[PDB]
Amino acid sequence: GSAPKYIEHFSKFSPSPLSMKQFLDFGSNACEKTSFTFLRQELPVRLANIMKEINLLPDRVLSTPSVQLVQSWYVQSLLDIMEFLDKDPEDHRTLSQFTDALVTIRNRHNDVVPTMAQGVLEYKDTYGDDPVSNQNIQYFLDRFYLSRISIRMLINQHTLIFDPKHIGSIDPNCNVSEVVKDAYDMAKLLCDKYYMASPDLEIQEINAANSKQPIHMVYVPSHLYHMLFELFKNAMRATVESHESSLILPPIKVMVALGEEDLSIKMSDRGGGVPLRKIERLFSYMYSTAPLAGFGYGLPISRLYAKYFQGDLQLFSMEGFGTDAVIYLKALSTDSVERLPVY
Numbered sequence: 001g002s003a004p005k006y007i008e009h010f011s012k013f014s015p016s017p018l019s020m021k022q023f024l025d026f027g028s029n030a031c032e033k034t035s036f037t038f039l040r041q042e043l044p045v046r047l048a049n050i051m052k053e054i055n056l057l058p059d060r061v062l063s064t065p066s067v068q069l070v071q072s073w074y075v076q077s078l079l080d081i082m083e084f085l086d087k088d089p090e091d092h093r094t095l096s097q098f099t100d101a102l103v104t105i106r107n108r109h110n111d112v113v114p115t116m117a118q119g120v121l122e123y124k125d126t127y128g129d130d131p132v133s134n135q136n137i138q139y140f141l142d143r144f145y146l147s148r149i150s151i152r153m154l155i156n157q158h159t160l161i162f163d164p165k166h167i168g169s170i171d172p173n174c175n176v177s178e179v180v181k182d183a184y185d186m187a188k189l190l191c192d193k194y195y196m197a198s199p200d201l202e203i204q205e206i207n208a209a210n211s212k213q214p215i216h217m218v219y220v221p222s223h224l225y226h227m228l229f230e231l232f233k234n235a236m237r238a239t240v241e242s243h244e245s246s247l248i249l250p251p252i253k254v255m256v257a258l259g260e261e262d263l264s265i266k267m268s269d270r271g272g273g274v275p276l277r278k279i280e281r282l283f284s285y286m287y288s289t290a291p292l293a294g295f296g297y298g299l300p301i302s303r304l305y306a307k308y309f310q311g312d313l314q315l316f317s318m319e320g321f322g323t324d325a326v327i328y329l330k331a332l333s334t335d336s337v338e339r340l341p342v343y
């Protein structure tokens, strides 16, 4: 076969990060031909850059089953997309079978998260959980997962639009507070199910420049929902379990602030907090892997969604009181550009 030749060829290119504007323009919308000619080049590039990094893991990680399995999905996926390079953009049947091909590739990779987690596990028992192993797992999986978020983004934008308000998974007029309440409502529903007490919500907006206007942005609301959901679930558990022997149950307070460049979402809880020394481990794939806890993408992945369009997600706590979690997002669509791992 040709996979090592392909990987090698296409890893010579750099991925091309897109901005919200580039994304919106792809989606308003007859330029299917153009998304196709873009993607049949860009996907192999992104696949091959990440595939190259996987193949440079030491052989005692690389030869484990979990990694072999995902390596075979990547090989197959890239091969699926090769078939279209010499194919004819004008032939409407080329276009339809390429969409079929993206969906098949999306389904194929759906279970990477639990697959990789078996690899982390196997490595922990098999070679240990020393700080140096931790940094390497961190470094690799943040890049692997960021890369994966970016590919799904490309693919979702194509299949949603080439099957008037929403542009695939981008909402150009996303009402942040609305996404906050929806994620609260959903986490409350689970909290009430498993704990039979749930905090309330207080939302406060601060629109610095337009004191009274509701706060809107261009964003991917499913991502924002993922992050808000994981935060609510954590804050609820902290709040509820820490106030079991007490009657008052503090609310979870969220502030949504709009600056000139940041759009910031703080979620404040009175769950008793975490000492400073234990905070980093909440972002560690390795320390948060062991053979309400069932729901959510997790902290480390929620931070990647934030980073993905040049934002961040940070935690700061006061042991004995509670924790603030903040999502930092870029306010302006012009500063929202894909952040892709640097190969």
Ligand SMILES: Cc1cnc(Cl)nc1-c1ccc(N(Cc2ccc(CN3CCCC3)cc2)C(=O)c2ccc(O)cc2O)cc1
Pocket: 230, 231, 233, 234, 235, 237, 238, 239, 241, 242, 269, 271, 272, 273, 274, 282, 292, 293, 299, 315, 317, 322, 323, 325
């Ligand atoms: C990471 C995670 C994943 N899945 C779920 Cl279900 N829970 C968490 C999670 C982890 C840490 C936290 N802790 C520490 C904590 C505080 C209070 C209790 C309750 N005690 C515990 C002993 C007695 C009552 C337990 C733990 C936070 O301080 C915290 C972290 C992130 C966060 O976003 C918000 C937070 O409040 C909160 C949630």
Ligand SMILES: CC(C)c1ccc(COc2ccc(CC(=O)NCCN)cc2Cl)cc1
Pocket: 057, 058, 059, 061, 067, 116, 119, 120, 123, 132, 133, 136, 137, 140, 141
């Ligand atoms: C995500 C899964 C697949 C996973 C599981 C485990 C790992 C671990 O990867 C390690 C572990 C230790 C070291 C230090 C070292 O001794 N390097 C020498 C290299 N021979 C380097 C790397 Cl790349 C990565 C990814």
Ligand SMILES: [Cl-]
Pocket: 142, 143, 146, 307
């Ligand atoms: Cl990163």
Ligand SMILES: [Cl-]
Pocket: 279, 313, 314, 315, 316
């Ligand atoms: Cl932090």
